[PDB]
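Wed. Picked up where I left off yesterday with centaurin gamma 1. The coffee machine is broken again, so keeping this brief.
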Amino acid sequence: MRSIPELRLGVLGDARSGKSSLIHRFLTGSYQVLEKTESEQYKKEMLVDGQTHLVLIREEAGAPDAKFSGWADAVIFVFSLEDENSFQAVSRLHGQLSSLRGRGGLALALVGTQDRISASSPRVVGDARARALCADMKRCSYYETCATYGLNVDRVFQEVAQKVVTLRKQQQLL
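Structure written out below (tokens, as returned):
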């Protein structure tokens, strides 16, 4: 039976983060103003190191639980660059993830979304501050995204998938 290599990617963020629109952009190429009130799962095929993977994505509406925290190979944290509470929410969410995971080591990403930046709702989260949150999270890379035109959307997903695959190859290299 031909193997189906699988990458399990979780996505965390508050309702102002832009996480639903970001997931939806990656999957479909479309921007839609969405707030999923609820957790949901999605699937996509991705080429990684020349090998086709099944990618499972769980978007979580609130705090991760031990189920989610133990299932993921990788977790993307999402906040809005114009919402301070969403940024503070990432560090809350990461505390929960870290404690409820009990495994090989997660690939992480931190995403600051640009979608809602306006004159009346300006960027409130400074670059250095966001990069400091990322520097204090293990195996984490930081991106700004804009799902409206696709800025770094595929990049985030692809780079987290690559991290998982490289970690796995490291493990089999031992």
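Quick read: The two ends are 26 Å apart (CA to CA).
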